[PDB]
């Protein structure tokens, strides 16, 4: 209340969970190959 | 005591020997009016970037 | 057991401590007659308040 | 009164305008401490001695 304010993050925990589920779904089905091709 | 703000009703159970309350930063938060026994909060006016 | 995530808790705590100290520092007089700016500005004359 | 037995009076429940004290020129000395003498008209006190 004295000029101090938080700011929101850009990404949200659902987008981060999309990322961290895409990486899992790739690693379980494709091995390393998806990383470099 | 001078100031600016938004006066509002409040549910602070001031005791009969008390007049006002303070916040951690040592500023007035609530007051008792000199003409009525009601207790009022003071809230600062809105601001932002 | 909830103690596993010590680091993530301590990185929040270390920040919260400083953020609280920065606001609590506002109370001090620094040698002035009174800490409240509006009080000084009310009880005194503009030539003195500075 | 005499300095060995100085005299005191307690004033309460009053409404007073100090401006006349600054229009008067009958005082050999007039000095105040801790409050600006011009703004006394805008203040309140619990007691005056
Ligand atoms: C016209 C007016 O303001 N009259 C007030 C009254 O409202 C108040 O209740 C009383 C103190 O109790 O002092 C007088």
UniProtKB/Swiss-Prot annotation, chain A:
It comes from the Viruses. Subunit of the fusion protein that is processed upon entry into the host cell. Mediates fusion of the virion and cellular membranes by functioning as a class I viral fusion protein. Contains a viral fusion peptide that is unmasked after S2 cleavage. This cleavage can occur at the cell membrane by host TMPRSS2 or during endocytosis by host CSTL. In either case, this triggers an extensive and irreversible conformational change that leads to fusion of the viral envelope with the cellular cytoplasmic membrane, releasing viral genomic RNA into the host cell cytoplasm. This is Spike protein S2'. It comes from Severe acute respiratory syndrome coronavirus 2. The gene is S.
């Amino acid at each position: 209340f004295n000029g101090l304010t938080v700011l929101p993050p850009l990404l949200t925990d659902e987008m981060i969970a999309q990322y961290t589920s895409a990486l899992l779904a790739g690693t379980i089905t494709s091995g390393w190959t998806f990383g470099a091709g | 005591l001078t100031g600016t703000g938004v006066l509002t009703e409040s549910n602070k159970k001031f005791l009969p020997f008390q007049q006002f309350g303070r916040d951690i930063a040592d500023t007035t938060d609530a007051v008792r009016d000199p003409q009525t026994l009601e207790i009022l909060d003071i809230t600062p006016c809105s601001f932002g970037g | 057991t909830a103690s596993a995530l010590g680091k993530l808790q301590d990185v929040v705590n270390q920040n919260a401590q400083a953020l609280n100290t920065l606001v609590k520092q506002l109370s001090s007089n620094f040698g002035a007659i009174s800490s409240v700016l509006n009080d000084i500005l009310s009880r005194l004359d503009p030539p003195e308040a500075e | 009164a005499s300095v060995y037995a100085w005299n005191r009076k307690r004033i309460s429940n009053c409404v007073a305008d100090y401006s006349v004290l600054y229009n008067s020129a009958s005082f050999s000395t007039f000095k105040c401490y801790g409050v600006s003498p011009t703004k006394l008209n805008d203040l309140c006190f619990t007691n005056v001695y």
